[PDB]
Symmetry: C3
Subunit: 341 residues, 3 copies
């Protein structure tokens, strides 16, 4: 027991929600204990019921958000149950050495491993499976990726000596999928990940996804699963993309404070319309809602947003501010005395 710090078990929750945590803390460094269980399973990924052979951490795309503070030690039990067919591992972009932990965590079905890494760098970071060679992109685009957030011990700041505090936090994991089609253009179904591999690799090689989804399926965060907020609330939106660039945009809002490279040692940019998550990274945006109603959160490639599945909804409760925006005149017939050339 060389490392004599208090230990604290964390129970992960399914995205887009985030386990209980403190923003600012005066506790010393702890050993934060997390468990991730690999689950290979068929999942539905679009509103027409298209299925595909997914591989996940904890049964979700993305994998759950892990939240720790700078100077904590993160002790991760990775479990690969004997119902799975492939070896798996985990690479933390937040960690230093051994390919992020990938070189120390390769496990066959029936095995588990315990990795500890010190959280020396603040920000939001991708974690993903990375077995070796062509298996790396295949496991990642099959759904084996998540994020970890390392907060400063004093919580967030605006980079100019003022504290920032969120009222609410959501984790939006964006996934690019490569689903094979038959000669007529219909999506193909398979009975195992292994059977899907050869056809999937051919789609992957052309670098155009068939689907781009938040929280694992088209429409996952719309309708009854819309994200909730209130006028006046400061909401932190963590966005990750393990493989492909994304350009997040809150329709009818802004990013008040945006870390687009996702690292809290850098001052955020202010008042962004659209921001940029580079493939293999996580970013974060803080917005204070000023108007009630429906907001669409999209990647602002609008083809991907509207036609390939990458749209989420916020439903915001509160009172409308007619000073910020108003309909002066409702739709009406163009006046007869109008000239419109």
């Amino acid at each position: 027991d060389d490392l004599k710090l208090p230990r604290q078990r964390v129970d992960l929750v399914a995205p887009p929600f985030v386990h209980v945590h403190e923003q600012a803390t005066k506790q010393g460094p702890k050993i934060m204990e997390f468990k991730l269980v690999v689950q290979e399973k068929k999942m539905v990924i679009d509103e027409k019921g298209t299925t595909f052979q997914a591989m996940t951490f904890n049964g979700s795309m993305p994998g759950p958000l892990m939240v720790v503070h700078e100077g904590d030690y993160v002790e991760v039990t990775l479990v690969n149950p004997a119902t799975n067919t492939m070896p798996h591992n985990i690479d933390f972009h937040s960690a230093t050495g051994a390919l992020g932990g990938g070189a120390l965590t390769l496990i066959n079905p029936g095995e588990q491993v315990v990795l500890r890494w010190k959280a020396t760098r603040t920000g939001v970071f991708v974690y993903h499976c990375a077995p070796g060679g062509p298996m790396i992109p295949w496991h990642v685009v099959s759904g084996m990726n998540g994020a970890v957030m390392v907060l400063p011990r004093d919580g967030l700041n605006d980079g100019h000596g003022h504290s920032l505090r969120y009222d609410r936090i959501y984790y939006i994991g964006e996934q690019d999928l490569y689903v094979p089609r038959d000669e007529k253009g219909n999506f193909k179904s398979y009975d195992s990940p292994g059977e899907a591999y050869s056809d999937t690799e051919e789609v992957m090689r052309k670098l155009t996804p068939t689907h781009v989804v938040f929280n694992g399926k088209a429409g996952a965060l719309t309708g009854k699963n819309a994200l909730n907020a209130n006028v006046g609330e400061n909401v932190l939106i963590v966005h990750s993309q393990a493989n492909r660039d994304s350009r997040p945009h809150l329709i009818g809002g802004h990013g008040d404070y945006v870390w687009e490279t996702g690292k809290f040692s850098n001052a955020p940019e202010t008042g962004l319309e659209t921001w940029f998550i580079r493939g293999g990274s996580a970013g974060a945006a803080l917005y204070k809602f000023l108007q009630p109603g429906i907001y669409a959160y999209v990647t602002h490639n609008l083809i991907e947003a509207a036609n390939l599945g990458a749209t989420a909804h916020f439903k915001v409760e509160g009172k409308w501010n007619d000073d910020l925006m108003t309909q002066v005149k409702a739709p009406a017939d163009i006046p007869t005395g109008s000239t419109n050339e």
Copy 2:
């Protein structure tokens, strides 16, 4: 008449030019009144005369640049003449609430609507049509997008307490187009936007444009329509892309001061070779010309620039500075006594 401010009618001009405005102002907030008229029409988009079914604000791709100051109110009359076939609306990324105004501006052919928004955020911002669902990307990539610039009341600054002033301003709207081809690879023609839709949506789904153009067509800002400047002039180039990333580059120049995320609350970067406009955003670059001659302004995917139409020209008048650059020896035969391995 709850809002008791002076009103000022603005006459928009066709890009790449920009309506008359002040950089710094000591006038108080005004209500700035703008009119936009939707026009569906067939347009030529390449040097071989390829046509396509365009939908525009004010008959231009992009739509015109609107210029206001922080704290102004922007009162927009959107008109959809009864010669058009579809409903249209407008979403301002500069505005707060109701999906940027899209939720308050949906109009059938024969109708108009008046929206007012307060310009609370500085920078350059995209505006675009967004009717609903798959119609959103289709109207945007059919040409229904423009930009608005909200200046600080004191005009631009370098983020370190020094004022920046432009001698000239150009608005470069970049458009990704998806023109269907027949089995032999020739571009198809249609008699209406509706007839084009199904074939166009199939091209859009593969996320590779057939054309990438500035000011609505290949070669629009070359030859006689080259942009003019003089040695010593500080030129502001506003660049927008409503749907797809762009990487602007002034060949033979630099970006002296670049807001690549396009928001004037952030200090510009200095001395850039190439900058990055994320899809769904506008950016701005200031350059002071130091040499006369021809400059190519490109997206630095050179395939898109040279082969898909995304090249503009500046013709700069003045005297050559042999200290910055000189041809020491004109092309000449390789000397006989040379070794070149």
Copy 3:
């Protein structure tokens, strides 16, 4: 002899190595003399032995890194031997005027030209061939691109008044290639660049590369050609992409200080997981190695990294730090008393 400064001949070396230079200097401005010789040749670009008709500066993809200091004059002899078949030229993104020098350097086979430019802007910059029209993207994606680094005379700093010094420097040139295939999907071979052109242009038009390589071929910087470093060394990695965006990531490390737009007048960002090189630019990242072992340097589109060739290796010598990372429990059978749902 209007310009009366000392002259210094520089001998270029093949990437990923960099010719001898000083970081900080108290010497005055010099005329730094460089020679580049164009070589058209067939080259192997993947581990299955696929060939393609390359065009290079000095026989390498990328062309060699040129290192000068702010205020130096750069005098470049470009040579196009009569064994070549096409005209060539050179465009320096670091230079001011005449399309970066392209308008002053067009040479037929059998000819040479001498261009001088003043290094007024600090950073790393792309140089590339740019003959005219569709020849521009074709020569660049055929391999005619490199980089130049203009150091501040005081060397690098962290943008907050502290000097940064590298122990080692590597230049990673990333190349997107467009190799035509036959009806069965096999790569086609040609006897000249001219014969390859028409088929290559068709692949280029679809904006999806067949290969994405560092230092001119898949696996070039793996195995015995891995890059060397030691625990504690500050390593500068210069990354260029003349045509297409890249998202560099050091697997198991970070970017301690990153200039992603590549310009030393801007303070670097700190502690990045993944950074972004916009097509037509060079960037630079400083990392201090903290752990020994193998590191993969990738573009974090993992399909491109693992399947299209864009992976390099660092082999780092030193002692493992179990405080930063440790395997707490080696792979072992899942305990019988475990529940993993």
